[PDB]
Design an enzyme around this catalytic site. Structure first.
Site, mmCIF file in Angstrom:
data_model
loop_
_atom_site.group_PDB
_atom_site.id
_atom_site.type_symbol
_atom_site.label_atom_id
_atom_site.label_comp_id
_atom_site.label_asym_id
_atom_site.label_seq_id
_atom_site.Cartn_x
_atom_site.Cartn_y
_atom_site.Cartn_z
ATOM 1 N N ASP A 122 -55.952 59.043 36.490
ATOM 2 C CA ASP A 122 -55.156 58.798 37.744
ATOM 3 C C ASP A 122 -53.669 59.246 37.567
ATOM 4 O O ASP A 122 -53.456 60.126 36.885
ATOM 5 C CB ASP A 122 -55.111 57.141 38.128
ATOM 6 C CG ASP A 122 -54.793 56.696 39.459
ATOM 7 O OD1 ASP A 122 -54.112 57.464 40.268
ATOM 8 O OD2 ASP A 122 -55.356 55.598 39.923
ATOM 9 N N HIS A 140 -49.890 55.455 43.205
ATOM 10 C CA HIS A 140 -51.357 55.124 43.267
ATOM 11 C C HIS A 140 -51.889 54.597 42.163
ATOM 12 O O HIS A 140 -52.586 53.564 42.242
ATOM 13 C CB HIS A 140 -51.904 56.487 43.575
ATOM 14 C CG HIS A 140 -53.436 56.597 43.792
ATOM 15 N ND1 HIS A 140 -54.511 57.038 42.803
ATOM 16 C CD2 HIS A 140 -54.221 56.346 45.092
ATOM 17 C CE1 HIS A 140 -55.590 56.741 43.238
ATOM 18 N NE2 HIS A 140 -55.625 56.678 44.511
ATOM 19 N N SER A 157 -60.510 54.312 46.451
ATOM 20 C CA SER A 157 -59.864 53.931 45.198
ATOM 21 C C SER A 157 -59.809 52.488 44.931
ATOM 22 O O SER A 157 -60.223 51.964 43.614
ATOM 23 C CB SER A 157 -58.337 54.473 45.090
ATOM 24 O OG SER A 157 -58.547 55.965 44.832
#
Lengths: 277, 92
Positions: free
Chosen positions: A24, A57, A217
């Site tokens: 990620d 994120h 996600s």
């Protein structure tokens, strides 16, 4: 009170026998929610751009999997690889190099069952699907986001790889998540759905900050946490047996199929992931 | 026998970088030699190339920065299974 998503998957700090690899963005590994639970590897392979925003994120997803207050598998350990830049963009080549790094790391120092979380998507890629298939056949469990394109997940990778567990997103009404004019992907390449709307998790804005985020996600991170709990309770499970357990313990036929395009209704699994009792 | 593939979502393509995938069971020593062979053949034709990475462990092959003009030549290299143009992935 508890975040809706943690209540939804609940029919103990579990998942301690499993290591979850996360490919990620950079992660704020000193955030109180995940400090000591995420080991940042030296791996970085990102394209040039076109710190608080850079790590948004990945920090949130690490919290979804193992976070102290709002994580699914609070006993699981995580190892992070940076394959997405500050804008959340990566390359298929960088992701391939990262998957190879995970396999090399495992051969050098084997531990227990491994779960690899791929909270990313690009177009259908023969090479990315093949690398995922090879890693799954080597005994590693892969979980990926179905994609946020309100489209057939078979047109995206790694969502389209059959050996990967592909996860769509549902909301508190158990309905498919809308994300602006788009939303969760659907179709025959999706294995199951999981909570992916307004998910409370670690915010990289400050050491104790929390923010709600939505997307496939987040749904995939719930399934990586559930898989870590299932494998820690039954470590001998093969990938086929684990997929059968995920389906068995899922809530069935609660999604209103009318949200999906007409022809995709019979092809999309009506399953919302949940932990075993 | 080898085929070429590129992303169908044209804005997500990254031309100029290619993943050369060799046949299953190709050893790391063969992958490195195939990469050197491509570099030598390309240099004879006046093209600069760069081997960014050599793959082994999951898939055998290599990552090369080069002009796509060299794809017909690269597809004739021994052990090639297929070649894929690099493309973007995004946080979901």
């Amino acid at each position: 009170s508890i975040p809706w998503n943690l209540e939804r998957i609940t029919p103990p700090d579990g998942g301690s026998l499993v290591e979850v690899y996360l490919l990620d963005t950079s992660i704020q590994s000193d955030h109180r929610e995940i400090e000591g639970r995420v080991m940042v590897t030296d791996f970085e392979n990102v394209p040039e751009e076109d710190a608080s925003k850079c790590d948004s994120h990945g920090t949130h997803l690490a919290g979804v999997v193992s976070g102290r207050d709002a994580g699914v598998a609070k006993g699981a350990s995580m190892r992070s690889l940076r394959v997405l830049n500050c804008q959340g963009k990566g390359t298929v080549s960088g992701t391939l190099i990262g998957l190879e790094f995970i396999r090399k790391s495992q051969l050098v120092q084997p531990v227990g069952p491994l779960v690899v979380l791929l909270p990313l998507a690009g177009g259908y890629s023969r090479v990315l699907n093949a690398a995922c298939q090879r890693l799954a056949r080597a005994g590693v469990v892969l979980v990926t986001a179905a994609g946020n394109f309100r489209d057939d997940a078979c047109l995206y990778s790694p969502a389209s790889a059959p050996e990967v567990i592909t996860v769509g997103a549902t909301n508190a009404q158990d309905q498919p998540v809308t994300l602006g004019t788009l939303g969760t992907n659907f179709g025959r390449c999706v294995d199951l759905f999981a909570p992916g709307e307004d998910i409370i998790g670690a915010s990289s804005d400050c050491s104790t900050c929390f923010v709600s985020q939505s997307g496939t996600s987040q749904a995939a991170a719930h399934v990586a946490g559930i898989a870590a709990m299932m494998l820690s309770a039954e470590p001998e499970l093969t990938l086929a047996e684990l997929r059968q357990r995920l389906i068995h313990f899922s809530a069935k036929d609660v999604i209103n199929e009318a949200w999906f395009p007409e022809d995709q209704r019979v092809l999309t699994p009506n399953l919302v992931a949940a932990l075993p009792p | 026998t080898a085929t070429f593939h590129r992303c169908a979502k044209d804005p997500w393509r990254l031309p100029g970088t290619y993943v050369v995938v060799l046949k299953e069971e190709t050893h790391l020593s063969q992958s490195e030699r195939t990469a050197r062979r491509l570099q030598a053949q390309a240099a004879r034709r006046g093209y600069l190339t760069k081997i960014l990475h050599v793959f082994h462990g999951l898939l055998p092959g290599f990552l090369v920065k080069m002009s796509g003009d060299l794809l017909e030549l690269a597809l004739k290299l021994p052990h090639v299974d297929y070649i894929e143009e690099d493309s973007s992935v995004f946080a979901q």
